[PDB]
């Protein structure tokens, strides 16, 4: 009856809506079997202390699923890792909704953890989705590399491997590196004249102000920048017509909470009509066995879902991260912010407003400028040569 579904959240205000949400959930799929309970504690300061609490409080109440959001005030320096670890033992699925840096994506260091917020690696899918219909194919890639740097390019290649086409070189430089202008000549001396960029805010600003003297900006020098490069302090540095970017929901955790609890309620309503459900233990103390009803839960959480929530239609992929995310293409036009259309996901729908490419042109210049490069190479042999 008391199918506890905890949710470690932000300050009390952001946790307030849960007790109102559970009543709606308790009423929609109502019966004398799904009388849920809610136990929650905010993101405590430090990390080890909260890791104690999640066993001191949450599984000490014998919970069945965990929901986690981002800390309200600080940055992503101390995102909750131990939740994926403390719940990592019993193999219970854990649902995140806002924390996003693409490290959590692979189900190898975090076993089982699905997110309703898509990591930045999907920009590569979006980048492909529009570079197909833009009359250019050859592309130059620039990115840092801590963990995400390899991920974006590797996904871009997993996409550009079935078309027998290949991109150009990728320039991997350590995060937080200045005076990196040496590689700009090496990239410039090549036919392709479109650039892919992705880095942290400070790194983007450094490699950004380290390019004006060198004439990387102008017509035929279209730049590719994601929300990481645009959102932050690097806003007041853009050229005349760079490609902005922006997501739909952002800080709208209420709708995410509603959709997540609806999906979880449907899944647990199916689950209650299943085989034996192991009673969750007293918690961390004493017992360290294996919760046999762990992967069974994610066996259906990963699949299906298909709920109709406020955020839209959620569809998780084979490895957690959802699919079919609506998206608002942004554009910077001389220190201004205007959109170009709506990327609903897997369908390209830009509007017919005014767009400006770098250099002020409004056209589709070739991915590689001019022509007549090809180099002959033979070997002295026979009357042929």
């Amino acid at each position, epitope marked *: 009856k008391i199918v506890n579904i905890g949710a470690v959240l932000s300050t009390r205000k952001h946790e307030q809506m849960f007790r109102e949400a559970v009543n709606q959930a308790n009423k929609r799929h109502g019966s004398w079997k799904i009388q849920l309970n809610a136990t929650s504690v905010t993101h405590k300061p430090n990390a080890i202390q909260m890791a104690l609490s999640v066993c001191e409080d949450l599984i000490s109440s014998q919970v069945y699923a965990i929901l986690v959001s981002h800390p309200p005030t600080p940055n992503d320096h101390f995102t909750p890792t131990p939740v994926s670890y403390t719940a990592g033992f019993y193999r219970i699925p854990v649902l995140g909704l806002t924390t996003r840096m693409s490290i959590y994506s692979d189900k190898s260091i975090h076993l089982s953890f699905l997110r309703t917020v898509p990591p930045y690696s999907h920009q590569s899918s979006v980048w492909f989705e529009m570079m197909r219909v833009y009359s250019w194919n050859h592309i130059i890639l620039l990115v840092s590399d801590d963990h995400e740097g390899r991920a974006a390019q590797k996904r871009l290649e997993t996409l550009l491997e079935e078309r027998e086409s290949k991109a150009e070189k990728v320039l991997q430089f350590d995060p937080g590196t200045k005076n990196v202008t040496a590689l700009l000549m090496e990239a410039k001396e090549l036919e392709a004249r479109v650039i892919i960029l992705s880095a942290s805010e400070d790194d983007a600003a450094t490699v950004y102000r380290a390019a004006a003297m060198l004439n990387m900006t102008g017509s035929g020098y279209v730049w590719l920048v994601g929300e990481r490069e645009i959102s932050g302090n690097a806003l007041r540095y853009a050229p005349d017509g760079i490609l902005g970017l922006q997501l739909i929901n952002g800080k709208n955790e209420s709708a995410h909470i509603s959709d997540a609890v609806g999906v979880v309620a449907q899944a647990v309503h*199916e689950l209650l009509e299943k085989e034996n459900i192991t009673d969750p233990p007293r918690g961390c103390v004493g017992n360290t066995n294996i919760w046999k009803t762990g992967p069974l839960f994610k066996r259906v959480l990963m699949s*299906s879902k*298909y*709920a*109709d929530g406020v955020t839209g*239609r959620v569809e998780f992929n084979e490895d957690g991260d959802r699919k079919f995310a609506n998206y608002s293409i942004m554009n910077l036009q001389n220190r201004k912010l205007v959109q170009v259309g709506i990327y609903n996901g897997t369908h390209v729908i830009p509007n017919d407003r005014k767009i400006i490419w770098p250099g002020g042109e409004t056209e589709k210049p070739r991915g590689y400028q001019m022509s007549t490069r090809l180099k002959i190479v033979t070997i002295h042999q026979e009357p042929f040569v």
Partner: antibody, heavy 122, light 107 residues
Framework: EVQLVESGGGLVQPGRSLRLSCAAS????????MHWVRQVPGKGLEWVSG????????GYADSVKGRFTISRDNAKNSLYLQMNSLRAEDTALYYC???????????????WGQGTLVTVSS | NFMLTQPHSVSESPGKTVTISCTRS????????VQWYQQRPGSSPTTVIY?????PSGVPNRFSGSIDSSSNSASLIISGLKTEDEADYYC?????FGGGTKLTVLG
């Protein structure tokens, strides 16, 4: 547009099985589960069954055990709640219906089909 | 289980408000979403009010919803007019339908 087309309403001798087929048109079928409510001459309706958006989840009300079964296919856009061993109480107005979501535990109802007459008597 | 409560039939002239109440006997009325359904004679049934206050897309307002428990009851209120307000009203809360109400125009 949203419309649950149903036909094949007629008279069947009690005890014999029946084969009903309700088709759809317009909206996308995948994102919605299909309900099965019916009225009866002289009284109101009662919720009976709901088939999941693809398969697996099937729910029944208090008196829907045994011959009162549901089935559906998501290939040729048909709904196949078929009846076997019918009795006199089964003579009523039958509607094939669809939930507002891919599940049916909420009993959310919209687009109330067209109606079919299954007759079971002497 | 539980049984709802709907009036057998009500009559109202055009230009006057009409009320149709669905009263739940066992359990809290608000504990389950009562859903008002309208079924015109000789036509496919339609929805009017669900989750105790909601109009479907395309419904020209004019249909409210009362969920005040009071004596463990709920009701549907329609603004005063009898243009096409002659049908059968069905209330459903959870797996159970009411007796039904028939509204007639005054001639």
């Amino acid at each position: 547009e949203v419309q649950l087309v149903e036909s094949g309403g007629g008279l069947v001798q009690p005890g014999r099985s029946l084969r009903l087929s309700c088709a759809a048109s317009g909206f996308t079928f995948d994102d919605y589960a299909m309900h099965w409510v019916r009225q009866v001459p002289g009284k109101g309706l009662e919720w009976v069954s709901g088939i999941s958006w693809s398969s697996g989840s099937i729910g029944y009300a208090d008196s829907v055990k045994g011959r009162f079964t549901i089935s559906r296919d998501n290939a040729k856009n048909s709904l196949y709640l078929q009846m076997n061993s019918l009795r006199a109480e089964d003579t009523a107005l039958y509607y094939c219906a669809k939930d507002r979501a891919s599940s049916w535990y909420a009993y959310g109802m919209d687009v109330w089909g067209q109606g079919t007459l299954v007759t079971v008597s002497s | 289980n539980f049984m709802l409560t709907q009036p057998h039939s009500v009559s109202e002239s055009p230009g006057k408000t009409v009320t149709i109440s669905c009263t739940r006997s066992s359990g809290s009325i608000a504990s389950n979403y009562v859903q008002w359904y309208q079924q015109r004679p000789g036509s496919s049934p339609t929805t009017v009010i669900y989750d105790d206050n909601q109009r479907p897309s395309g419904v020209p307002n004019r249909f409210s919803g009362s969920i005040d428990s009071s004596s463990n009851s709920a009701s549907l209120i329609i603004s005063g007019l009898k243009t096409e307000d002659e049908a059968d009203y069905y209330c459903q809360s959870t797996r159970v339908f009411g007796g039904g109400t028939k509204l007639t125009v005054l001639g």
